[PDB]
């Protein structure tokens, strides 16, 4: 659903789907080729 | 405590060169399949680094610290188990100890009065300082275990460390990989951040020795200390987000 975001270090609006990419657990978010936020990890624990 | 070992011989400081190694992550932001341009405190490629080797042929002078140094160490008998940091390395100023005493990595910034040659002597009793007071920062990291068995031969591990200073914060990068100098490419991951806020100008290596105070010996180990400059790098990310290649703009 198109909802608002208020994370521990992120704020925006978008649709949260299941990601199939790799990540590092010592980071908060990741960026695509167009330098926009395309992934977010769970502040409570972790989950891009 | 104040007296050092008289059976130590200092090796002359010869010079080698690093091929492509010495690239770390500049921030804690994940990137994937991009070509990022950034300028931070890095090592230029094909630059002169100082050669050190411990085999009674010791090599430990007091090296200066302006902005950043690297600790590219190779080990077989685990001699390099700590590093001292500070301004003049005595009790009149603050002195940082990062000591791995085979239980954990003890990080303490007190006023340690160091001797002429601080060294460790498994570990029997770690004593390098005579007095300590007015302490400021304490930290307990992840526990690790070390050994002091005498081994001489081919190296099979590489431990690179980054000690930088930006706005009082001391970031530590680390990379552990198996392999007198390894070649190729690597990438150093962030480990821990230290908000101390002191002034450090000189540093020295804590060499751990084994077997009253005259029959101490050590195995075979080597490390390299360079000098950093704020150069601009190109940063090539793969699909997994790991550093695969780097380009120094002030090289060719």
Domains, in order of start, for chain B: 9-252 (2.60.120.960)
Which of B39, B22, B25 is CA-nearest to residue B249? B39
Q: What is the b/e burial string over B158-191, where b = at least 16 CB atoms within 10 angstroms of the residue's CB?
A: bbbbbbbbeeeebbbbebeeeeebbeeebbbebb
Instruction: Please state, in angstroms and rounded to a whole number, the distance separating the CA atoms of residues B123 and B209.
Output: 9
DSSP reduced 3-state for B135: coil
Task: Answer yes or no: are the C-beta atoms of B185 and B244 closer than 8 Å.
Answer: yes
Torsion of CA A33, A34, A40, A46, to 10 degrees: 20
Closest by CA position to A45, among listed A20, A28, A23, A21: A28
CB contact under 8 A, B32 and A30: yes
Report yes or no: A24 at the B interface, CB cutoff 8 Å: yes
How far from B214 is each of B1, B90, B201, B219, CA to CA, in Å? Answer: 14, 25, 32, 16
CB B189 within 8 A of CB B174: yes
Residue with tokens 């007015």: B134
Contacts of residue B234, Cβ cutoff 8 Å, sequence gap at least 6: B35, B36, B37, B245, B246, B247, B249
For residue B235, the tally of other CB atoms under 10 A from its CB is 19
Q: Resolution in A for the shown PDB structure?
A: 3.7
Interface probe, candidates B24, B27, B28, B32, chain A, greatest A C-beta count within 10 A: B32
Q: Are B193 and B31 in contact (CB under 8 A)?
A: no
Are the C-beta atoms of B169 and B41 separated by less than 8 Å? no
A31 near B CB under 8 A: yes
Question: What span, in angstroms and rounded, lies between the C-alpha atoms of B78 and B221?
Answer: 7
Give the number of C-alpha atoms closer than 13 A to the C-alpha of residue B98, restricted to the C-beta side. Answer: 19
Q: Nearest residue of B to residue A24 by CA position?
A: B30
8 Å CB contact of B32 and A31: yes
Residues of chain A in contact with residue B34, where contact means CB-CB under 8 angstroms, are 31, 33, 35
């Amino acid at each position: 659903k198109c909802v608002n975001f208020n994370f521990n270090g992120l704020k925006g609006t978008g649709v949260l789907t299941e990601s199939n990419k790799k990540f590092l657990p010592f980071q908060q978010f990741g960026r695509d080729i167009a330098d926009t936020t395309d992934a977010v990890r769970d502040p409570q624990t972790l989950e891009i | 405590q104040c007296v050092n070992l008289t059976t130590r011989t200092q090796l002359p400081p010869a010079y080698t060169n690093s091929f492509t190694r010495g690239v770390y992550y500049p921030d804690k932001v994940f990137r994937s399949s991009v070509l990022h341009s950034t300028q931070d405190l890095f090592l230029p490629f094909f630059s002169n680094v100082t050669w050190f080797h411990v085999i009674k042929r010791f090599d430990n002078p007091v090296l200066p610290f302006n902005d950043g140094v690297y600790f590219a160490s190779i080990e077989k008998s685990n001699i390099i188990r700590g590093w001292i940091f500070g301004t003049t390395l005595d009790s009149k100023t603050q002195s940082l100890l990062i000591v791995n005493n085979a239980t954990n990595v003890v990080i303490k910034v007190c006023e340690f009065q160091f001797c002429n040659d601080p060294f460790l002597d498994m570990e029997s009793e770690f004593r390098v300082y005579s007095s300590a007071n007015n302490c400021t920062f304490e930290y307990v990291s992840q526990p690790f275990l070390m050994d002091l068995e005498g081994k001489q031969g081919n190296f099979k591990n590489l431990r690179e460390f980054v000690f930088k200073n930006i706005d009082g914060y001391f970031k530590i990068y680390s990379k552990h990989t198996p392999i007198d100098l390894p070649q190729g490419f690597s990438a150093l991951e962030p480990l821990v951040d230290l908000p101390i806020g002191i002034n450090i100008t000189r540093f020295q290596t804590l060499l751990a020795l084994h077997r009253s105070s005259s029959g101490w010996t050590a195995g075979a180990a080597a490390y390299y200390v360079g000098y950093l400059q704020p150069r601009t790098f190109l940063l090539k990310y793969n699909e997994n987000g790991t550093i695969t290649d780097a380009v120094d703009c002030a090289l060719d």
